[PDB]
Amino acid sequence: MVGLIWAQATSGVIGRGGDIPWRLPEDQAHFREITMGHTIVMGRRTWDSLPAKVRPLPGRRNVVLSRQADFMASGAEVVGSLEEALTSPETWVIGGGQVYALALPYATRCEVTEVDIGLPREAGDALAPVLDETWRGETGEWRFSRSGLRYRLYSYHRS
Amino acid sequence: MVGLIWAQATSGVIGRGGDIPWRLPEDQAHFREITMGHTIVMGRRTWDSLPAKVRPLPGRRNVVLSRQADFMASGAEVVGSLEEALTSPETWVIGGGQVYALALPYATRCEVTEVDIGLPREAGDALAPVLDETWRGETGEWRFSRSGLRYRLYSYHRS
Ligand SMILES: NC(=O)C1=CN([C@@H]2O[C@H](COP(=O)(O)OP(=O)(O)OC[C@H]3O[C@@H](n4cnc5c(N)ncnc54)[C@H](OP(=O)(O)O)[C@@H]3O)[C@@H](O)[C@H]2O)C=CC1
Ligand SMILES: NC(=O)C1=CN([C@@H]2O[C@H](COP(=O)(O)OP(=O)(O)OC[C@H]3O[C@@H](n4cnc5c(N)ncnc54)[C@H](OP(=O)(O)O)[C@@H]3O)[C@@H](O)[C@H]2O)C=CC1
Ligand SMILES: CC(=O)Nc1ccc(-c2nc(N)nc(N)c2CCC2CC2)cc1
Ligand SMILES: CC(=O)Nc1ccc(-c2nc(N)nc(N)c2CCC2CC2)cc1
Ligand SMILES: [Co+2]
Predict the structure, then answer these.
(1) Which residues of chain B are within 8 Å of residue A155 when distances are taken between CB atoms?
(2) Domain total for chain A?
(3) Residues in a beta bridge with B93
(4) Which residue range forms the structural domain that includes residue A128?
(5) What is the CATH number of the domain that holds B63?
(6) What is the chain A residue with the closest CA to B141?
(7) Which of A134, B85, B97, B144 is most deeply buried (CB count within 10 A of its CB)?
């Protein structure tokens, strides 16, 4: 099974320069709640974005998506295929932009935080998936982060 | 995964006299979208309340949690355990008021429609269970039904 979770600016950006152009403790607990205990899959670059000092994320089955037998994610599992990770019952695709579009076929749910930040689409930006006609959800209430940036939450299901 | 799904009055009422005292098509397409494909678990009263012309719910593993050995539900399994209904990887307890409180201990997700209705809790109503402190979630924003009614959804999570 697959879920996709990501935090995006309005413009669609999920990463820039290997980090995230914001920080939102409202989004952080949201992300911990949904993924705690479940399987988390991330691309290799996302894994690098995790300081070795919060790696792995605690309480979850950390899976790093790479292509070779020659990469070690230390404290995690390194699988050449997406499908090698989906051995558990809930699997959460936690980025970045590749795995998303790679996992979007297997996916029924997208949990999306939309940060109200005016972030023009720069080249090389990692981007949130392209959710076609099929997906359904509705716009949330613009909620106030202590950060001072509006955010809102989205949930999608498709069948 | 064990989810509990219900639509309730702002007083807590989910059913009364073997029927539902309201009608919300937006709820029905939502209830349908959430359960579609999955094991649905219902009480035997819930199962009866469905006219034949809507039995069983299409595209889902209907499981009826009942008590007669000679009880067969045309288009469903009759289990005694809740867990014998909890076989499935995604499992939705769809009612009713007793089956709910039975399952809540094994629930990781509660998914709630709240109809904005002046409905007293009268003896003989079916009600929604009480979500303990393990539960965390967000209060939806009041949307407007083509029935003409304000409703909002609740998603509650505990792990
Ligand atoms: N805002 C948010 O909500 C999120 C933000 N991010 C941000 O996303 C950014 C980076 O994400 P991105 O840049 O898209 O790179 P990824 O995180 O997607 O990692 C990509 C890597 O995964 C491996 N890979 C990709 N496709 C496959 C495949 N089909 N089979 C096997 N292995 C595969 C390769 O690793 P190798 O090269 O070793 O083969 C590739 O380099 C960071 O800034 C991160 O913080 C992260 C998560 C969500
Ligand atoms: N608004 C909504 O979202 C929904 C509303 N409703 C409403 O709820 C009302 C009825 O619900 P309710 O009255 O609570 O009855 P329930 O629907 O909760 O069904 C009660 C069932 O409990 C079963 N049961 C309980 N424990 C066990 C056990 N350990 N082993 C086996 N069977 C068990 C009984 O089986 P047996 O009977 O075989 O002993 C009985 O069928 C109606 O008005 C209905 O329309 C129902 C579903 C959804
Ligand atoms: C900035 C910080 O310190 N922590 C932090 C960073 C990102 C997220 C997050 N949030 C949402 N909504 N979806 C997601 N897929 C992610 C995950 C991204 C990562 C793989 C590591 C939450 C907290
Ligand atoms: C509106 C209409 O005509 N039918 C209708 C009645 C109820 C529900 C519903 N809704 C939520 N949120 N949870 C639920 N478990 C259920 C139903 C469970 C049962 C069938 C008996 C949806 C549509
Ligand atoms: Co589904």
Answers:
(1) 155
(2) 1
(3) B4, B41
(4) 1-159
(5) 3.40.430.10
(6) A141
(7) B85
